[PDB]
Symmetry: D2
């Protein structure tokens, strides 16, 4: 009944995921938990999620037990639960394009030789591989995706590298009978969706949005890495913010009579945990597809849990389709 | 082709309405204007809206031309258009419960004797009477509603006094074959709808809203009059704000792992003009119902343009039903 | 070496004071603590402050040990330290005008008969009586001030009732050789001083401040009680804020060329603790004056620690004069 | 009685300066104007400031009348006054290091051959040269400073290139009997001074400032150019902001009992005009020093009007010393 999970990139998101499973390890499956569609997704309780392997390139992570690696190097997300030794030692994966200038100047790459990822996946009997590679790691993400396909392991693509949403890659998974949920994991409530909802509000109520500004500040490596009319994008890295992300947004519009109507807000979130619940749902959905031997992109799951899914669908419809998929 | 309009309560809302018609008097009916469903609602262009009568109780308004009365006494909304003399002299209506302690201490009641409103409506051949009485004026609003019924004049109830939404009053209008659109005119984008949309966002995304605060400040008589877990309501009267209304709102919730997620915002609007467009649509809808000899609450119009309609309907559905009503 | 303290009004401020002494009971006198001029003020270490008596009128406080009374009824300030039983039982003081409509509707007055305060003070051998009566309690504050004079007990007036700053009362204390520090205890950083500093900034830099607004919200009885161009004052009571006080302030000015220059801010503080340190310094200053047999207002202490002192003096000068007073 | 002024760098600051003189051309010298120490500084009325020459490198400015050049290319500050043709044609200055990558990719350099600046200054009989070179233009600013010295023209250094504050350069001006006021012109109320005052407030009131963040956004070339614990610095370029600069700042501290005390604010200013008044005072001070034949840094003026003066002095003292200098 377990879901054997392997993690690529033991960063802040990996930390929120491992801690998250620990946090809700004893949750009642008849109750509702924030950030999770179901404490028990299909047959899988959160506790059924077992971490059996992990890959990284940082000297302070490779060779260390997963339980330590999640709190090492630049990892700095909020600690919600203690994580006992897992006995899972982080292995050396191929760096490829996963480490940009800012990262390289911040960490030291492990001296260990990159292992044979496909063999590593098979030896660990992994069911689902979750990829947390830094933004821009196209070669690296596609490399890991390929290993997953070759090892017959389901893939959950958490970063904005088009794989599940690239017909070419969708076909590779389909033909191999390997499931994939992916291309940019969603956050529960982040700046993007908040701005979308409000912009829609203006529009639906007849208020013309003339100008908009979105300033984002954070203090983690994901933010640092991304640093490397309408305005939007990472603004400034603020060390003491750690894994938190603050969004300062201003909407300026005109209502009846061209009368000015403004709205300014600040959204405060802990970035990584904002997606841990979503990932946990993705992981189990990918597991279910695998139990059924259905390869290719898991359509309902990707539409509801990812920002760049194979096929676009309204959230509620995507949600309903995902609920049907679960029941099977 | 004209819509003969009479105004009860020449305050800030009345000012935005009269100025609004002037502002869009030459608008192209194939274009879209903020705050208006249609420049030409059915057969009625904004310009077809003619002000033929008005009633008030303030010594600085009664006896004055409507064009002056809208800028008199405590009226202080934003001026978007010059208004030439209308030759419509503001008449003395019965005060009843339209003037509370705060208002009474602020203005001087007109020495003139209250006129016979029913006769006044008939003599002016009014088609639609729009009521802008202060909040709490139940006896006064029902009195004016009654006059409207007796004169065979359609009624648009802009304040939170239940008439269209009170089965008893709905029946009175129905039986008299007089249309009524009403009970609290909507604003395009105000604090209420903004908070609703965001609260829904949290809920839909699995974020538990634990605490919420909504502080409102303004500088007009409507605000002054209203001054006479969850928190909400008029907070403080700020003189120099005039007709503007600022809402400071904070939402505190918990996302996956009980991680704190907050959102704080400030909405800046010019309160009265925020409903002028809505009123203009209500007025013409009421006119159309009258042209058809259909009495009682105009269901589609009230559902879409009012906060407390006879029957609740999702905005988009109410909107679609209103579009069908227009075509007839 | 102890400073025998009695408290009038066991509310939020009393709670922050008692907890405060506990919190810094073991502080190093060569270190600096936020909110305190000296861990050891003259000969008195914070720990030398002993609570020996207290008076209230609330049924949930009178008859209870001080350690419980500080956390009873509507008290809701932040808890910074555990407070062990003190064996000091809260006595029934005369209500007089200390309980307004809002308070009366919130609490139940103790059935106990008001005691003879003068006798109570003498029996407890009190050195300093600190008054935390609600705003507006003039008769009550002057009554307690009188008892203090009669018992030869130094008085620290924390509320805005003019006593130390009223020549008539200043003379009563002087003639009795009883010290008094008083009339509205200062906060370290509150809305008032923050606005003062910024308004001064504008002025000194040649920016004309045209309009200003200050909105305050809180969730304690002090705030509730106070609820009973320029804008300023208590705006709205927000239950879940508890003892916290949030100030939303906006300054609008004109710089060179009449160019608009604005500044908007939000100050978040825990109201009661914001003055506990100040009170602790006041208490010891009053003790020192008593050791010297010097009656009347302690000038340096009042100028630096109170909002409405007998004599106004620039903070730094008042501070320097207070430092000289300490050395003696 | 005129002050012959030449401008190096016809950007936003140059625009605010030229418009500023026009705006207050008819000001009463017995009145006080925001941003100016005196409408009449010594013998010089604002109107005595005459623009007689200007230098730039942009193809859309060189060869154009100053009155047009101030509103050309990327200039986008607020327009406070119409500026009639001046008959002063912008000349081609040597680019040197005044145009970085971001600027070069934004504008096209003039095809004209750089002129002999020293000769140009002499031919125009310039009294004061104001330098508005972009940040980082060390070689260019020192080149222009040298020309000024050689032409016997007073220099006002508005950018952060150390000249007046570099003993070596201070001596060059002194030995040549040429005055210099300089190194980074002050703003009336900008983010820096606002943060300074508040940080000082915390400190003086016993509140320990633990963390601070300062985010700045703007929409002009100065901001774009600058883009090329504690946090501070240019955060993000927001096109539609134009010459406006918004500073989002948050201060987090601990008050008595280690209780959290926070302050968050947003300062909205029009960046360039925020220094026009200061420059006008600097220009006349430099003129007075020249009338007296006193070379080297004008100490009082630099201490009060510049961020990096030769010698540091408290603002009020520097202000008083400057007032004495004026009287002479
Ligand atoms: N945190 C969120 O809410 C959220 C939401 C959507 C998308 N994402 C994306 O998910 C990713 C995860 O971010 P974090 O989790 O915030 O990032 P992170 O920077 O903390 O960690 C990335 C990890 O990958 C490791 N890594 C780098 N190259 C590697 C390679 N070749 N092989 C194996 N490991 C390698 C790094 O050493 C590091 O431990 C980012 O791309 C982010 O943009 C995050
Ligand atoms: N402004 C908005 O966006 C908006 C939205 C929804 C509802 N409303 C409601 O609409 C009403 C109109 O507010 P304003 O228009 O903002 O208010 P207002 O205070 O400016 O004007 C009300 C007017 O009614 C007059 N009046 C009082 N008693 C009267 C009587 N017996 N007979 C005739 N006239 C009388 C007053 O003298 C005054 O001119 C308020 O009740 C308000 O709450 C306004
Ligand atoms: N908290 C601050 O930072 C601050 C700063 C300056 C001034 N003050 C003033 O100090 C006072 C203390 O406020 P809290 O401490 O915040 O107020 P509070 O409302 O929490 O407590 C006042 C207490 O006085 C008791 N009381 C009322 N009448 C009494 C009487 N006749 N005899 C004895 N006790 C009586 C009440 O039952 C209550 O326990 C207020 O007047 C407040 O405005 C507070
Ligand atoms: N605006 C303020 O409040 C303020 C306050 C302090 C300091 N400053 C500094 O003053 C300077 C002026 O900024 P703006 O005025 O905002 O900048 P800007 O970018 O608008 O204009 C600089 C001008 O210099 C011209 N220039 C560039 N290289 C040149 C060269 N070699 N010779 C002649 N002209 C050349 C450019 O083409 C442009 O017109 C900046 O360095 C800024 O940082 C501005
Ligand atoms: C069955 As359930 C509590 O996950 O919706
Ligand atoms: C016909 As139309 C421009 O009002 O939607
Ligand atoms: C002597 As001390 C540390 O209180 O200033
Ligand atoms: C003499 As004056 C009005 O500039 O201070
Ligand atoms: Zn992350
Ligand atoms: Zn209104
Ligand atoms: Zn208090
Ligand atoms: Zn500038």
């Amino acid at each position: 009944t377990e879901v054997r999970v392997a993690i690529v990139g033991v960063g802040n998101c990996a930390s929120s995921l491992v801690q998250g499973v620990e946090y809700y390890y004893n949750a009642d499956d008849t109750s509702t938990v924030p950030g999770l569609m179901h404490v028990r997704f299909g047959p899988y309780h959160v506790r059924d999620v077992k971490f059996v392997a992990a890959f990284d390139v940082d000297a302070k992570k490779v060779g260390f037990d997963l339980s330590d690696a999640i709190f090492a190097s630049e990892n700095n997300t909020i600690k919600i639960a203690d994580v006992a030794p897992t006995n899972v030692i982080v292995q050396r994966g191929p760096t490829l394009d996963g480490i940009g200038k800012y990262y390289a100047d911040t960490i030291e790459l492990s001296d260990a030789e990159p292992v044979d990822v496909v063999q590593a996946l098979k030896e660990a009997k992994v069911d689902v591989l979750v990829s947390y590679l830094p933004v821009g790691s196209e070669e690296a993400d596609k490399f890991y995706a390929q290993c997953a396909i070759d090892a017959g392991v389901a893939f959950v693509n958490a970063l904005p590298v088009f794989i599940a949403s690239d017909p070419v890659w969708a076909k590779k998974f389909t033909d191999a009978r390997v499931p994939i949920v992916g291309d940019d994991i969603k956050s529960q409530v982040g700046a993007t969706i908040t701005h979308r909802v409000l912009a829609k509000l203006f529009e639906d109520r007849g208020v013309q949005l003339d100008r908009t500004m979105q300033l984002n500040v954070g203090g983690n490596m994901d933010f640092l890495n991304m640093l490397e009319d309408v305005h939007i994008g990472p603004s400034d890295h603020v060390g003491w913010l750690d894994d938190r992300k603050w969004a300062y947004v201003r909407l300026e519009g005109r209502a009846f009579g061209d009368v000015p109507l403004n709205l300014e807000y600040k959204l405060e979130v802990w970035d990584s945990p904002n997606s841990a619940g979503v990932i946990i749902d993705a992981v189990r959905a990918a597991k279910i597809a695998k139990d059924r031997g259905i390869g290719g992109p898991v359509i309902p799951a990707s539409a509801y849990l990812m920002k760049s899914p194979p096929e676009q669908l309204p959230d509620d419809i995507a949600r309903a389709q995902l609920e049907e998929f679960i029941i099977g």
